[PDB]
Amino acid sequence: QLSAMKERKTNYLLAVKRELLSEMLVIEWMETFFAHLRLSLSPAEFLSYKHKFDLAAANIFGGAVRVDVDLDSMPAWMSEKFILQGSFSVTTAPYAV
């Protein structure tokens, strides 16, 4: 159950890392694709597809970073330290009603 809440805390932070990874993996999808374009295009079509790559760059990834990742944006339970208290005392049973 301690790993149950630890999974609640870390899988949210790891989903943040998964979507930050998703946006920067898909800028690699742009570049590794266009590297194959350079080796497959006659020079007339390369000037056209350089304009299309520039336009797709400025339209998709043109502005700022839309994901904010900030403690304010996080839920309210990304703030506390998982306080533990109690005991497991093993004693006998009373011999009288």
């Binding site: 309210a76 339970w77 703030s79 506390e80 330290k81 306080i83």
Partner: peptide, 12 residues
Amino acid sequence: DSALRRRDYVAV
């Protein structure tokens, strides 16, 4: 800690 907040609301 906010769970401890809710426990004290029920209790004293």
